[PDB]
Amino acid sequence: KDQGNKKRQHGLEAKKSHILAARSVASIIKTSLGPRGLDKILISPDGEITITNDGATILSQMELDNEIAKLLVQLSKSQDDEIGDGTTGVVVLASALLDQALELIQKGIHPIKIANGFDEAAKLAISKL
Amino acid, res. 95? S
* CA dihedral of residues 52, 57, 59, 64 (deg, nearest 10): -100
* Contact residues for 39 (Cβ-Cβ < 8 A; gap 6+): 32, 51, 52, 53
Number of residues in the chain: 129
Nearest-approach distance from CB 3 to another protein, in angstroms? 9
Dist CA 44 CA 28 (whole Å): 18
In angstroms, what is the minimal distance from the CB of 29 to another protein?
22
Q: Which among 4-12, 51-59, 77-85, 94-102 is the span making contact with another protein, rule CB under 8 A?
A: 4-12
Kindly state whether residue 16 participates in binding another protein, applying the rule CB under 8 A: no
Binding residues for another protein restricted to 32-91, rule: CB under 8 A = 65, 67, 70
| Helix (H), strand (E) at residue 120 | helix 111-128
Beta-strand ranges (E) seen in the chain are 40-43, 49-52
Q: Is 112 in the site for another protein (CB under 8 A)?
A: yes
Mark the segment that binds another protein (CB under 8 A) among 37-45, 46-54, 80-88, 107-115: 107-115
113: contact with another protein by CB under 8 A? yes
Shortest Cβ distance from residue 24 to another protein (Å)? 18
List of residues contacting another protein (CB under 8 A): 1-2, 8, 10-11, 65, 67, 70, 110, 112-113, 116
